[model samples]
Target: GQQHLLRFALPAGKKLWPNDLREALAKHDLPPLFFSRDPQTGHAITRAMRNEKRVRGYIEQHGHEPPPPTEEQRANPLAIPGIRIVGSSTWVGILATGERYKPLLEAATLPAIQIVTQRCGRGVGVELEQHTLSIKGLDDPKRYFVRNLVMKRGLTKTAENTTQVASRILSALERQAVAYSLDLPPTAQVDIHVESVVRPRGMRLVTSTGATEQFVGLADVEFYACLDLKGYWFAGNLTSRGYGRIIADH
Candidate 1:
């Protein structure tokens, strides 16, 4: 089974950084802050990866173990065992097309695999016993086989929403790329779906009678990516000011 994780750090104080970051994270249900306290100390604003355990478990429960992780899987932490991550980012907003945060995707899929395997008497090979049983049927087949498979559905629906967000961002990028005559390969692509979006709503009062106040809101944005056949891919929201047309709804 393949598990990939990718982490990105965004410097604080950009105008739209928080909004874009929030949108990207929300879409995929990933926590946006790796660590936050002050402007200088904050780092690792966004992270993603694939849910190998869930994916493998699903296969095993269905009667097969997932294939071993590939070189690309090991090297690129963001590569999902059965999915892809594509996109670009500017300041805080990230437009993406492929699978939502690769790491989160992996997390979401893990449970699904576990459930399926349990039902079929074959569990994901993460555990020693499960690994052994995955290759060889359980000694007590009657006892092991679940008469009624109880599947705790994973976040495929959320994943699909995240993918949609990525597509919107990509559409915006395409229009701009054409207008600018950027020489992008046919496969050259961009992802603009925002998984999370955050913004401050109130300002601190600096008067004798007034005290400090803070307000914040979160939103999920759709994003997508365009693939350039040659190489390299851009991820982030396409509606970003200088990057592409601002997605009106987002």
Candidate 2:
């Protein structure tokens, strides 16, 4: 109803990676903006990482080439040119009404950052050929499909119904699209689907009795979905860590 949020592929090879739960996501400082929710405070904003204007300005001067960002630069504050860090590597830019999120069409890409996280410091070259899909939608096939919708909240009683989760996602996209003032609304009816309930794997917080156990965290997805909007979204626990990523679906 609001917009035809669209997505597309960058093209093949060098733009892919495999996911393993053993890895920790915090390694790659990412923000937590999503069409999803927070488990504890019920606030994604509270749990988010900000790389706002200050960092935005930094990147402007530095580009992705790197002298590497300092720990202080990584530390976020208000009014900075920040962005929502995503845990998923295959970024899904969920947008609505308009598109305009600074340094427009920005992505967690290239240079040392990507190179460092792309292969878990394992050393491999990735072809920077894969670029943005900012969907130029054709209303004909208005019924877009989304398979393998595996979203997690860590333990928030977040609600999800086709309508509800759809609303959550669509609203998020809309809020951002309008925030940036670039993208537009969907042209027709759209539907989002998922195969099963998002089950929780309990965390082992303590172990005074013996060894430790907990809900160790990690994120990733094998699914892909997009809309008539300009950008795309790919998810992974360590996407924030720069491990799992989305690329041109070749």
Candidate 3:
């Protein structure tokens, strides 16, 4: 279950988002799996964590609550190896994982291309310049720090007492580690230090229904684990869209 990840960083000059990166990739013919939607299903074929058939089957078999896309209802989610367009205001990132890595590497070799931003709505062009690539496995065991860790209502509701927040964070972290096959010894001490809550605020999310608000339980956290996580490693809701990002504390 080793996770193979390839990341491409866009230029810093023009601010970009995941939607903008997807737009560029679609035009360049990088891969349909990266940006194309299923004609029949309409739902995106690739989603964070939902990237392996076995994982989906396992979820169904175990009856684990698939993270709901909305507050309405919970359903079992599907999985498979695929792509994610992750971005920040400063840099846009394209991450291809599992069986999807080779195509992205090939696409990365392409010369810079122009991406039209959805923000401007006027088809403003921004160039995704010559980019650098980082290929690595997310399995090293080490301490890490994460900021802007956004957990959903289902997760946060478990921490009625603020004192239990750290426990919840560690639980979520361990769940991710297990999913990625980061083997930790039973004796390995896993802990998360809640540095601070990122003052409560509404994190806007544009959903299929409409733009909805997620009240964030955003926290700046430092934790010790048996594994090392790369910079920009994300968790919680909307990760494929780059919402829950973590940085190596070291």
| TM-scores of all candidate predictions against the true structure | 0.20, 0.36, 0.55
For candidate 1, write residues 5-86 as lDDT tens digits. 2222222322233333333333443332211111221322112235766766667676776555443334323321122221
Pairwise TM-score winner, candidates 1 and 2? 2
Candidate 2 clash figure, as a count = 55
Indicate whether candidate 2 or candidate 3 has the larger TM-score. 3
- lDDT by residue for model 3 (196-231), tens: 444434466555345676554555455555444442
The TM-score, computed over Cα atoms with residue i paired to residue i, of candidate 3 is 0.55
**Model 2, 175-239: lDDT tens per residue?**
44443444643534333332222432333322113336444322212222334543443232222
Cα lDDT for residue 150, candidate 2:
28
Q: CA lDDT of 210 in candidate 3?
A: 53
Residue 98's lDDT in candidate 1: 27
> Who is ahead in lDDT, 1 or 3?
3
Worst 10 residues of 3 by lDDT: 70-79
The predicted structure with the larger lDDT, 1 or 2, is 2
Candidate 1 weakest ten by summed lDDT: 127-136
